[PDB]
Specification:
Keywords: Acetylation, Calcium, Cardiomyopathy, Disease variant, Metal-binding, Muscle protein, Phosphoprotein, Repeat. By secondary structure, the chain is mainly alpha-helical. It is 52% helix and 3% strand. It has six helices and two strands. The chain has a two-stranded antiparallel ribbon. Helix 1 crosses helix 5 and helix 2 packs across helix 5. The N and C termini lie far apart (36 Å). 27% of the residues are buried. The protein binds 7-{[(5-chloronaphthalen-1-yl)sulfonyl]amino}heptanoic acid and calcium ion. The site of 7-{[(5-chloronaphthalen-1-yl)sulfonyl]amino}heptanoic acid (V8Y) has 14 residues, from helix 3, helix 4 and helix 5. The site of calcium ion has 6 residues, from loops.
């Protein structure tokens, strides 16, 4: 649980955080615990056209699930937003090439919110 990102979460205004909060629920949409797990993570991942396996999804979850809970709650997910928000291009490794390869937060959230902010009508199945 990075403290710098922790502050980032608190930094997000009520409105900005609200939008991010919506994305959080989307990942766990239908989650009994409400925590974003590999299963709750892949669901949204598929929404963006991603088809990551649960076993591999665990790595993505761990990205923000430093607690080893296996699930990224609101705070854990919110960190993800700040993780790529303040991270222009830095990682523990992930080899060379677009040092980021992070779930396109831009469109990612757009899919969860179904286009919340004018523009396209929404989405089409
Ligand atoms: O061409 C390929 O085979 C790669 C397919 C693309 C999959 C990579 C994205 N995987 S991901 O689950 O969307 C993901 C990546 C990085 C950080 C994350 C955090 Cl902090 C939270 C939740 C998910 C995160
Ligand atoms: Ca956790």
């Amino acid at each position: 649980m990075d403290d710098i990102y922790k502050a980032a979460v608190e930094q997000l205004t009520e409105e900005q955080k609200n939008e991010f909060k919506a994305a959080f629920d989307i990942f766990v949409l239908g989650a009994e615990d409400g925590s974003i797990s590999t299963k709750e993570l892949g669901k949204v991942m598929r929404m963006l056209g991603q088809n990551p396996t649960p076993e591999e999804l665990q790595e993505m979850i761990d990205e923000v699930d430093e607690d080893g809970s296996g699930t990224v709650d609101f705070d854990e997910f919110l960190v993800m937003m700040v993780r790529s928000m303040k991270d222009d291009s830095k990682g523990k490794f992930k080899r060379p090439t677009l040092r980021r390869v992070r779930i396109s937060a831009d469109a990612m959230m757009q899919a969860l919110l179904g286009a919340r902010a004018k523009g396209h009508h929404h989405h089409h199945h």
